Design an enzyme around this catalytic site. Structure first.
Site, PDB file in Angstrom:
ATOM      1  N   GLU A  77     -24.209 -17.257  -8.500  1.00 34.45           N
ATOM      2  CA  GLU A  77     -22.746 -17.266  -8.521  1.00 34.45           C
ATOM      3  C   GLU A  77     -22.173 -18.635  -8.850  1.00 34.45           C
ATOM      4  O   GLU A  77     -21.161 -18.787  -9.531  1.00 34.45           O
ATOM      5  CB  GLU A  77     -22.229 -16.814  -7.155  1.00 34.45           C
ATOM      6  CG  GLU A  77     -22.480 -15.351  -6.835  1.00 34.45           C
ATOM      7  CD  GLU A  77     -21.512 -14.443  -7.580  1.00 34.45           C
ATOM      8  OE1 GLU A  77     -20.607 -14.981  -8.254  1.00 34.45           O
ATOM      9  OE2 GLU A  77     -21.650 -13.207  -7.494  1.00 34.45           O
ATOM     10  N   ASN A 107     -10.170 -15.198 -13.017  1.00 31.65           N
ATOM     11  CA  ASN A 107     -10.377 -13.851 -13.538  1.00 31.65           C
ATOM     12  C   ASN A 107      -9.218 -13.386 -14.399  1.00 31.65           C
ATOM     13  O   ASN A 107      -8.122 -13.950 -14.322  1.00 31.65           O
ATOM     14  CB  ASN A 107     -10.609 -12.890 -12.357  1.00 31.65           C
ATOM     15  CG  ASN A 107     -11.890 -13.276 -11.634  1.00 31.65           C
ATOM     16  OD1 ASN A 107     -12.011 -13.192 -10.417  1.00 31.65           O
ATOM     17  ND2 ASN A 107     -12.874 -13.720 -12.408  1.00 31.65           N
ATOM     18  N   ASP A 146      -7.496 -10.820 -14.087  1.00 33.94           N
ATOM     19  CA  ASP A 146      -6.423 -10.267 -13.256  1.00 33.94           C
ATOM     20  C   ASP A 146      -5.595 -11.374 -12.620  1.00 33.94           C
ATOM     21  O   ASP A 146      -4.669 -11.127 -11.844  1.00 33.94           O
ATOM     22  CB  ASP A 146      -7.007  -9.336 -12.204  1.00 33.94           C
ATOM     23  CG  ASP A 146      -7.684  -9.993 -11.029  1.00 33.94           C
ATOM     24  OD1 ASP A 146      -7.814 -11.230 -10.931  1.00 33.94           O
ATOM     25  OD2 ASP A 146      -8.128  -9.248 -10.125  1.00 33.94           O
ATOM     26  N   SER A 166      -6.626 -13.501 -10.420  1.00 35.19           N
ATOM     27  CA  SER A 166      -7.193 -14.059  -9.194  1.00 35.19           C
ATOM     28  C   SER A 166      -8.205 -15.140  -9.559  1.00 35.19           C
ATOM     29  O   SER A 166      -8.535 -15.334 -10.732  1.00 35.19           O
ATOM     30  CB  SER A 166      -7.839 -12.966  -8.344  1.00 35.19           C
ATOM     31  OG  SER A 166      -9.059 -12.568  -8.974  1.00 35.19           O
ATOM     32  N   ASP A 204     -12.109 -17.079  -8.253  1.00 35.24           N
ATOM     33  CA  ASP A 204     -13.221 -17.123  -7.298  1.00 35.24           C
ATOM     34  C   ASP A 204     -13.543 -18.557  -6.883  1.00 35.24           C
ATOM     35  O   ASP A 204     -13.472 -19.488  -7.688  1.00 35.24           O
ATOM     36  CB  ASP A 204     -14.457 -16.445  -7.881  1.00 35.24           C
ATOM     37  CG  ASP A 204     -14.168 -15.062  -8.426  1.00 35.24           C
ATOM     38  OD1 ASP A 204     -13.437 -14.290  -7.779  1.00 35.24           O
ATOM     39  OD2 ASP A 204     -14.667 -14.733  -9.516  1.00 35.24           O
ATOM     40  N   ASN A 226     -13.296 -14.290  -3.783  1.00 37.94           N
ATOM     41  CA  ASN A 226     -12.143 -13.954  -4.604  1.00 37.94           C
ATOM     42  C   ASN A 226     -10.793 -14.009  -3.905  1.00 37.94           C
ATOM     43  O   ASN A 226     -10.580 -13.546  -2.786  1.00 37.94           O
ATOM     44  CB  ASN A 226     -12.322 -12.547  -5.203  1.00 37.94           C
ATOM     45  CG  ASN A 226     -11.221 -12.282  -6.215  1.00 37.94           C
ATOM     46  OD1 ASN A 226     -10.224 -11.630  -5.904  1.00 37.94           O
ATOM     47  ND2 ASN A 226     -11.403 -12.808  -7.418  1.00 37.94           N
TER      48      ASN A 226
END
Ligand code: NA
EC number: 3.2.1.17
Length: 129
Positions: free
Chosen positions: A35, A46, A48, A50, A52, A59
């Site tokens: 990750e 992201n 959308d 958001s 991370d 998230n």
């Protein structure tokens, strides 16, 4: 901070991640590797809107507040910036919440795509645990 493999294994073990919800330590270390490459300062945005955060790429839509994800739920009750610390404590406390949520570690796309069903034990090979 960028962690060493065994160093992270030891820290996570210390914070109670070994076999947490039946996921062995190899799983958590593998997930962190893919990750964030073991870097507590990793951020990724992201489509959308958001973002991370941190070593487990948590998230902002559901788990932390970063002030810029409209309709964020902040289920770990923390600012996302807390997730970037050299101390993995808050990252760990939040991960425990996530993995208990129903889908277990499938919540982490890279764990699902890169660690699940592999010999994750190799990630802790050689460490003094
Ligand atoms: Na390996």
């Amino acid at each position: 901070k960028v962690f060493g493999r065994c160093e992270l294994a030891a820290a996570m073990k210390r914070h109670g991640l070994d076999n947490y919800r039946g996921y062995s330590l190899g799983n958590w270390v593998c997930a962190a590797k893919f990750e964030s490459n073991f870097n507590t300062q990793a951020t990724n945005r992201n489509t959308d809107g958001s973002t991370d955060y941190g070593i487990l790429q948590i998230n902002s839509r559901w788990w932390c507040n970063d002030g810029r994800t409209p309709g964020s739920r902040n289920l770990c009750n923390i600012p996302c910036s807390a997730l970037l610390s050299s101390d993995i404590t808050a990252s760990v406390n939040c991960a425990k919440k996530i993995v208990s949520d129903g889908n277990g570690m499938n919540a982490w796309v890279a764990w699902r795509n890169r660690c699940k069903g592999t010999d994750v034990q190799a990630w802790i090979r050689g460490c003094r645990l």
